[PDB]
């Protein structure tokens, strides 16, 4: 398949995911730069440039969203899986082979925070995910490095 098809398909999938996030009633107006002192393993805040950090961020988000049973979270997780498998193709286009990043060991506290403050976790996660994806689009036009 031509690479331009991949370039447009990435944008289509990103927009689909972000609209799915907007459909959720919880995260209707929370913003994406809100600071919570207990949830610092949620990726976000500081900008991301390199492809490797991008794939790492998506892997962490997949691991974090695995711990919720709602149907919408399941569909969004499937779309994230597809997006990761796609982004590896863009990595391979410029001969910059990437590893299959794993669920980072920095997720030690996750479960604990869950059983303490479940609701909050959910909200923040989804919100920040949406925000992060926006950045991704605005950076995919400038063709960031390997």
């Amino acid at each position: 398949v031509p690479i331009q098809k991949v370039q447009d398909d990435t944008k289509t999938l990103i927009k689909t995911i972000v609209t799915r996030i907007n459909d959720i009633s919880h995260t209707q107006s929370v913003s994406s730069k809100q600071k919570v002192t207990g949830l610092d393993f949620i990726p976000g805040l500081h900008p991301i440039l390199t492809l490797s950090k991008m794939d790492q961020t998506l892997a962490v988000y997949q691991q974090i969203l695995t711990s919720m049973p709602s149907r919408n979270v399941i569909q969004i997780s499937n779309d994230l899986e597809n997006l990761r498998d796609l982004l590896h193709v863009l990595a391979f286009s410029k001969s910059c082979h990437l590893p299959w990043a794993s669920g980072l060991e920095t997720l030690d506290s996750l479960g604990g925070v869950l059983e303490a403050s479940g609701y909050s976790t959910e909200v923040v996660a989804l919100s920040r995910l949406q925000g992060s994806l926006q950045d991704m689009l605005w950076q995919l036009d400038l063709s960031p490095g390997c």
Binding site: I24, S25, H26, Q28, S29, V30, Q34, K35, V36, T37, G38, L39, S70, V113, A116, S117, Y119, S120, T121, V123, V124
Partner: protein, 766 residues
């Protein structure tokens, strides 16, 4: 006498010299005193002892640690003996013989107890030389005197303890208190509430240990209380508490209870109190918050309160309490929609730009549940029901109804009269519940409400006063009877009121033309003693339908059902107003003086017949007053003969009621048949459906009142057609099927008061 008080409880026993019956007396080695009193066990054991055997005492140091108390159950005085000489090389199989007595209160001299007064219990020692022994003491002698004497049999050597007397109750060691939990109450104060043992008959003072232990700030605050449950003051966040409580007698001496496993309770960086609130729609609530940031308590002047992390709360509702306690007070709050699987609102407290992830829950339940219900016509059953498919905020609670009604009525004043009797109501497929009351006091005022139990509390809906006799639904009237009046032309409705209720009633009749769909008309009757009514209708005997409903007069109660419709029957009412418009024809030779005249007329139409006229008749009048009547049946054409000069004929209609009144007339007369007054006639087809007829006439002497024009097709011998024309008009329009190709004729006749003269005949259109 011969008794050493155990002051204090702790004492150490050491045996010193004074082999089958070698007994050595043992004494307590105190700091300043040494008491050696012989027990009442052996009195005849004064036997000579060889000096050499004392060398064995060099290798056997009889040092023992003997203690005991009364347990909290006030049942067993378990006594412990420990061997100080913990020699694992050799283990002695020593047996303990205990003699204990509980003398009663005797006011006649303190006599020394004799042999056999004490009780023998074989005391059990464990593998590791520790001996626990059970002593049954009646509860009535707890404050009395108890005596102890111990005998140790080790390797054939007897060791004798002195006599010990002490009150069991003043040194009771309690059991380790249990039933303890550590939650924050609704006022920012942890409670250490333990189920202190009930078997203890005296108040207990407890030593309670805890502290403020954190990562950096560490301090110990050990305390002593006297209540069975305590409530600490001003709990701070991020400080671990290691609480551990033991008990002892509050008054006088005692022995501390068993130490329990320490309980650790750690609060997080933000503490809320109360953490969960359940409140109905339209009330006012409050909260609290304490914040710690990198081991420093944040001042209350920079704290901001959030709501679902979505919109910031306006500063107007913030209140300051102390250095580090705030207040937020919601005003007139709404219902909380279910956001996904979460059925609650989260309220945060935070400062500056960072907000912790711990939150305070807030539920809101709506309580306006509607109850409203009937009383059936037999005044027995009362049936009602309340919705629960619209209101959300539930699917998380069991529901139940309540009663309260005794005297005659309700709706006087609060309260809900907290005495209540539950009643179970079932479920139906319609989505609304229901349940039945019977037998019911018709004049007793029930007060109903719904009670909602929930995972956090209880809530009550606003009540409702209902009196059954005023909410009755009457049964619909029977024997409804509609009948068209006679000789008048009105509709008569008759009926009979239902037996129940025994109040006054108003009826509402609704009626119209019988048919598939009708635009029925409504009418009201406002009298109890009126039971039949008469109304006017436009037609006469087009079939009709009527239905009736009943209601109580004063506006109370509910409407009834619609009765079974009662249709009328068609039947004639009175005499026809108008007979037929009858015309003559002649089919015979002109030369004859006798003419066979055939009278013809249209069948009458409904409203003229008023319904139906089953018979017609002809009547005659000669110059000699020759009059007679004869039937014609349902035949609309008759014929007879005429020979006399002047003869009038009349056509009448006879039906079920009587003969017609206003009818037309016409006379035959040859002598005046020789008169003509019409000079010219013109006819012209405007089109296939319109023809114009005009005429120019001449005056005469007699009074002319009506003409008649007869036309028929000339190509084919069609039926003769005619229609009435008044003498006043001079022009007329004819509207029926016509084609100009075929040929028609016309014949206009002038008729006077006593016959018809010469006619005017035209054979073609002009």
């Amino acid at each position: 006498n011969l008794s050493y008080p155990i002051t204090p409880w702790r004492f150490k026993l050491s045996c010193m010299p004074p082999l089958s019956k070698t007994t050595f007396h043992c004494c307590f080695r105190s700091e300043q005193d040494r008491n050696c009193s012989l027990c009442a066990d052996n009195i005849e054991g004064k036997t000579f002892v060889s000096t050499v055997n004392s060398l064995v005492f060099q290798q056997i140091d009889a040092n023992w640690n003997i203690q005991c108390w009364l347990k909290g159950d006030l049942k067993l005085f378990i006594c412990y003996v420990e061997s100080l000489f913990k020699n694992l090389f050799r283990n002695y199989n020593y047996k303990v013989h205990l003699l204990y007595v509980l003398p009663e209160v005797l006011e006649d001299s303190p006599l020394v107890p004799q042999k056999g007064s004490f009780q023998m219990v074989h005391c059990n020692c464990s593998v590791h030389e520790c001996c626990e022994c059970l002593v049954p003491v009646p509860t009535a002698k707890l404050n009395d005197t108890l005596l102890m004497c111990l005998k140790i049999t080790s390797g054939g050597v007897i060791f004798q303890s002195p006599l010990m007397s002490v009150q069991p109750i003043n040194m009771v060691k309690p059991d380790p208190p249990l039933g303890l939990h550590m939650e924050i109450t609704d006022d920012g104060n942890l409670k250490i509430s333990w189920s202190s043992p009930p078997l203890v008959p005296f108040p207990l003072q407890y030593q309670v240990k805890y502290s403020e232990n954190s990562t950096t700030v560490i301090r110990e605050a050990d305390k002593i209380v006297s209540a069975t449950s305590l409530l600490v003051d001003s709990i701070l966040p991020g400080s671990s508490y290691e609480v551990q409580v033991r008990g002892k007698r509050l008054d006088g001496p005692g022995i501390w209870s068993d130490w329990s496993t320490p309980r650790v309770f750690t609060t997080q960086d933000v503490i809320y109190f109360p953490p969960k609130i359940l409140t109905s729609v339209g009330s006012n609530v409050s909260f609290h918050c304490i914040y710690k940031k990198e081991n420093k308590i944040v001042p209350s002047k920079e704290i901001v309160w959030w709501m679902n992390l979505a919109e910031k709360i306006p500063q107007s509702q913030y209140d300051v309490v102390s250095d580090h306690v705030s207040k937020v007070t919601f005003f007139n709050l709404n219902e909380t929609k279910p956001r996904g699987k979460f059925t609650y609102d989260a309220v945060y407290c935070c400062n500056e730009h960072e907000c912790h992830h711990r939150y305070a829950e807030l539920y809101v339940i709506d309580v306006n549940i509607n109850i409203s219900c009937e009383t059936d016509g037999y005044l027995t059953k009362m049936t009602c029901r309340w919705s629960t498919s619209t209101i959300q905020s539930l699917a998380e609670s069991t529901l139940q109804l309540r009663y309260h009604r005794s005297s005659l009525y309700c709706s006087d004043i609060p309260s809900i009269h907290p005495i209540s009797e539950p009643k179970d109501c079932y479920l139906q497929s319609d989505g609304f519940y229901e349940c039945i009351f019977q037998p019911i006091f018709l004049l007793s005022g029930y007060t109903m409400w719904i009670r909602i139990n929930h995972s956090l509390g209880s809530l009550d809906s606003p009540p409702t006063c209902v009196l059954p006799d005023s909410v009755v639904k009457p049964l619909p009237p029977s024997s409804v009877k509609a009948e068209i009046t006679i000789n008048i032309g009105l509709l008569k409705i008759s009926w009979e009121k239902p037996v129940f209720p025994e109040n006054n009633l108003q009826f509402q009749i609704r009626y119209g033309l019988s048919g598939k769909e009708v635009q029925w008309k409504m009418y009201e009757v406002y009298d109890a003693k009126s039971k039949s009514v008469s109304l006017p209708v436009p037609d006469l005997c087009a079939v009709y339908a009527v239905q009736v409903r009943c209601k109580r007069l004063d506006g109370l109660g509910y409407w009834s059902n619609w009765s079974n419709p009662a249709y009328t029957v068609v039947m004639d009412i009175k005499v026809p107003m108008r007979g037929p418009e009858f015309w003559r024809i002649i089919n015979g030779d002109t030369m004859k003086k006798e003419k066979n005249v055939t009278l013809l007329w249209k069948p009458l139409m409904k409203n003229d017949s008023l319904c139906s006229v089953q018979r017609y008749v002809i009547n005659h009048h000669t110059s000699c007053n020759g009059t007679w009547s004869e039937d014609v049946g349902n035949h609309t054409k008759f014929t007879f003969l005429w020979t006399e000069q002047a003869h009038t004929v009349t056509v009448l209609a006879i039906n079920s009621i009587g003969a017609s009144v206003a009818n037309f007339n016409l006379t035959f007369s040859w002598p005046m048949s020789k008169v003509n007054i019409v000079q010219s006639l013109s006819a012209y087809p405007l089109n296939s459906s319109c023809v114009i007829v005009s005429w120019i006439l001449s005056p005469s002497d007699y009074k002319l009142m009506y003409f008649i024009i007869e036309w028929k097709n000339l190509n084919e011998d069609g039926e003769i057609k005619w229609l009435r024309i008044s003498s006043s008009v001079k022009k007329y329009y004819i509207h029926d099927h016509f084609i100009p190709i075929e040929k028609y004729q016309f014949s206009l006749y002038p008729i006077f008061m006593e016959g018809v003269g010469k006619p005017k005949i035209i054979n073609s259109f002009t």
